[PDB]
């Protein structure tokens, strides 16, 4: 779109209004660990995420070099990047502040997210993953509602994708909970590609469509009302039991087939990014007039 080029270029006119970033430049505005911060060498209000690492300088220098490539990647479907510095045992990643938050907390605000909005979400996520693989040869590795951000302008962008291989290893401890978006092939330790990101997107879409994490599937009573499990039990359910599916009554055939193609267990049979690009569901969704900013501001309250 012509408009998207303008706001992208206007993002790069804000790029040199700072040169380097350090701790004393920022004042904590609020908590969204990520923080909304006020920059003072430049009037930009930014999002500052801090990752706690106790580790030697040499590898952090390697971390910063790997993180500087985010200055190079720019797209209307991935969130913009300001800079990355180190200070006092935490490395900081500075990015755009998106006043809408992540899709998980807007789903917490709403009851369920309608199909028409999820269509535009699908298009942007597919093109964002396509941009990263085709232009930078990286896969996201962590697609889930908590890392898909929205704003009042109406754009949606992906964040928190695995750009630094050393940063993955340098993180001391991970947080494993009851919601898992990892693909079956990744859980079994076999070769994986962007097909795992496509599974993660499909599982994220059905959760946002129904208003509940869909594994294990709900019984008949819970499906009508809408309209204590160990970690290994869930993971083994993802690997061995049939994938979740949308209810056949309330959603169109195109949407049901779309998520079904995303949740095929065999990654070779699972749809790739190009096949999705032409699936009847997003051809239909692309040629639709939906005020995404209006839906966001009216239901969340901005």
């Amino acid at each position: 779109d012509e408009q998207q080029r303008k706001r992208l270029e206007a993002f790069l006119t804000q790029k040199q209004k700072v040169g380097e970033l350090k701790d004393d430049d920022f004042e904590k505005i609020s908590e969204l660990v990520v923080f909304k911060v006020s920059h003072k060498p430049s009037g930009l209000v930014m999002a500052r995420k801090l990752i706690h690492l106790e580790i030697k300088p040499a590898i952090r220098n390697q971390i910063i070099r790997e993180l500087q490539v985010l200055h190079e990647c720019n797209s209307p479907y991935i969130v913009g990047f300001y800079g990355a510095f180190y200070s006092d045992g935490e490395i900081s990643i500075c990015m755009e502040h998106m006043d809408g938050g992540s899709l998980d907390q807007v789903l917490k605000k709403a009851g369920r997210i309608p199909e028409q909005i999820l269509g535009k979400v699908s298009i942007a996520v597919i093109k964002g993953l396509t941009y990263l693989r085709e232009k930078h040869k990286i896969m996201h590795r962590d697609v889930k509602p908590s890392n898909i951000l929205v704003n009042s302008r109406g754009e949606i962008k992906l964040c928190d994708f695995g750009v630094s291989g050393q940063l993955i290893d340098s993180m001391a401890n991970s947080f494993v909970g009851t919601r898992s978006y990892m693909s079956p092939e990744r859980l079994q330790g076999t070769h994986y590609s962007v097909q795992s990101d496509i599974w993660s997107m499909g599982l994220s879409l059905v959760e946002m469509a129904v208003g509940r994490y869909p594994i294990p599937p709900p019984d008949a009573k819970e499906l009508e009302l809408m309209f204590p499990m160990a970690i290994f039990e869930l993971l083994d359910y993802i690997v061995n039991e049939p994938p979740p599916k949308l209810p056949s009554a309330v959603f169109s055939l195109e949407f049901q087939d779309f998520v079904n193609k995303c949740l095929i267990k065999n990654p070779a049979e699972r749809a790739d990014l190009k096949q999705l690009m032409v699936h009847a569901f997003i051809k239909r969704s692309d040629a639709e007039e939906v005020d995404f900013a209006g839906w966001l501001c009216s239901t969340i309250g901005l």
């Binding site: 401890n173 991970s174 494993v176 909970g177 859980l187 330790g189 970690i231 083994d236």
Partner: protein, 277 residues
């Protein structure tokens, strides 16, 4: 409700606290003077006082321990909300630091000997009816042939798991847990109620045996969720990709056995390690 330091058989007159030795999940570990000593300061929330008095009996169990391959428990004083565990100071470096030092050769003979030392100490702790529950390379100290086991039994009172509906996993923890434990992990599981046993400690030693030869943990590449599923269904690596014989790989196959009853005791394991080339 309290434990005093004059209760102990080590004659105690003064205790100096020095610098912090290193960062750790459970309490702080400082240098000390008594000879030099290692002081671990812990804080208790003044709750679960029945779990507290159970901690007292576990400490009094440590009192009856003395073995050349087991760190010398010297004393423990408790003035809530502050607790302190005082053990002999280990010279040298941790096995974790030695195994990851490129300037140090670890031939098959030395790895057999280091393993036999840990087995002897673990056999002693088992004979005394004590489960380690957290055997790992960071809790073994090696000083030019002297091998000592550290931090046995702390995990029961530890609290290293404490996000909402999200359990904290550190990198090396999962690969030491036997499959029966891995299948139990949950965002609200606690260390006091995990099914540890003598078999789980033998599994943890099997992980160290892999670490001695590969010079890295198993499942080094993969994330935590993949490790949980693979270890739960019983998938385990081997040492042939680095060219180790069957004798050294049988050790893993016995120690990492999926069924608990198929894992050997430490005395039987000592027999098996004696027969390596």
């Amino acid at each position: 409700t309290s434990i005093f330091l004059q209760e102990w058989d080590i004659p105690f007159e003064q205790l100096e606290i020095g610098e912090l030795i290193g960062k750790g999940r459970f309490g702080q570990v400082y240098h000390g003077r008594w000879g030099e000593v290692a002081i671990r300061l812990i804080d208790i929330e003044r709750d679960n006082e029945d779990q507290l008095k159970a901690f007292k009996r576990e400490v009094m169990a440590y009192r009856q321990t003395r073995h050349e391959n087991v760190v010398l428990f010297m004393g423990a004083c408790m003035s809530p909300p502050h607790l302190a565990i005082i053990t002999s100071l280990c010279k040298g470096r941790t096995l974790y630091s030695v195994v990851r030092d490129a300037k140090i050769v670890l031939d098959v003979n030395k790895t057999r000997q280091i393993a036999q030392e840990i087995v002897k100490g673990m056999g002693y702790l088992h004979a005394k009816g004590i489960l380690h529950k957290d055997l790992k390379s960071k809790n073994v100290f090696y000083d030019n042939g002297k091998v000592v086991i550290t931090d046995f039994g702390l995990f029961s009172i530890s609290g290293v798991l404490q996000r909402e509906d999200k359990l904290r996993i550190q990198n090396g923890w999962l690969c030491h847990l036997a499959p029966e434990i891995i299948r139990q992990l949950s965002p609200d599981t606690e260390e006091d109620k995990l099914p540890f046993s003598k078999h789980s400690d033998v599994f943890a030693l099997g992980t160290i045996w892999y670490e001695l030869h590969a010079r890295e943990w198993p499942f080094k590449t993969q994330p935590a969720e993949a490790i949980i599923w693979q270890m739960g269904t019983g998938m385990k690596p081997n040492l042939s990709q680095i060219g180790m014989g069957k004798e050294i790989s049988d050790i893993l196959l016995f120690c990492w056995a999926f069924e608990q009853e198929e894992r050997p005791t430490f005395t039987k394991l000592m027999d098996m390690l004696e027969k390596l080339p």
